[PDB]
Amino acid sequence: MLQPKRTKFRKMHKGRNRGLAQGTDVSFGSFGLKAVGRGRLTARQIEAARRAMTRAVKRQGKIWIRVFPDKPITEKPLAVRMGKGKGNVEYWVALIQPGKVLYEMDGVPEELAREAFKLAAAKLPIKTTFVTKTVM
Template sequence: MLMPKRVKFRKSQKGNRRGKAGRGHLVAFGTYGLKSLDAAWITDRQIEAARVALTRFMKRDGKVWIRIFPDHPVTKKPAETRMGKGKGAPEYWVAVIQPGKIMFEVDGVTAKVAEEAFRLASHKLPIKTKFVKRIS
C-alpha cells in the first residue's frame, strides 16, 4: 500500500475539508484525467483498487499517472478502550482530496477506452468524479 517512507510527525490534526483544489486541477501528464467533484479522504486501499481497475481494463496499453498520495495519517484507539488517555495510534493513511483535483491521468489510449477505464475506477472511490480531457 502507498504510504510515506518517513514523516516528521507520526500524528496530525484533522484539518478542514472546505475549499477547492488550488493546485493539481489541470491535466498535466496524460491526455485524459479523472477529476474529483467532492471533498473526501481517500485511503491507500481505495487508490490501489482504482489503479488496479484502470490497468486491468487498459490491458497494459497506455500509461497511468497517480496524481494523489496518501500522506495524512488517521489514528484509531483500540477496541473497547475507555475515553481519554491520549490520541490513538496511526491506523492507516489517506489522501486529502478537494473538489477539482485531478486524481488519475492516462495517455496512449483512445478517449472511449479512457472513459470506460475511469468509469470502472470511479466505482472504487467514495466520491463523485468527472472525466476530463487535456486543454491544448
C-alpha cells in the same frame, strides 16, 4: 499501498478540509479523472482504483497517480475509554478537494479511456468526472 517513507512525525492533528484544489488541468497525459465531491481517500481505495483500470487496458499506455496519502489517520482500539492518549495510526488518507485531478493516464484511445475510468470511479467514494487535456 502508497505510504510516506520516513515522515517527520507519528501523528497529525485532524484538521478541516475546506476550499478548492490546485491540480485542475490534465497536465501530463491527455485524459484525467477530476473529482467533483469533497472527502478523503485512504491508501486501500487508492490501490484498488488503479488496479481496476490498469487491467482494463491490461498493459496499455502510461498511468499517472496525482494524489498521495499524507495525512496519517488514526483510530482508537475497541473497548477503550476516551482520552488516555492519541491512538496509533491505522491508515493513510489524502484529503480531496473539489476540482482535484486524480488518476491521469495517456496512450489509450478515448472511448476505452472513459470506459476504464468508469470501472475505476465505482471504486471511489468521491463523485468524479472524466476530463480531457485542453491546450494551455
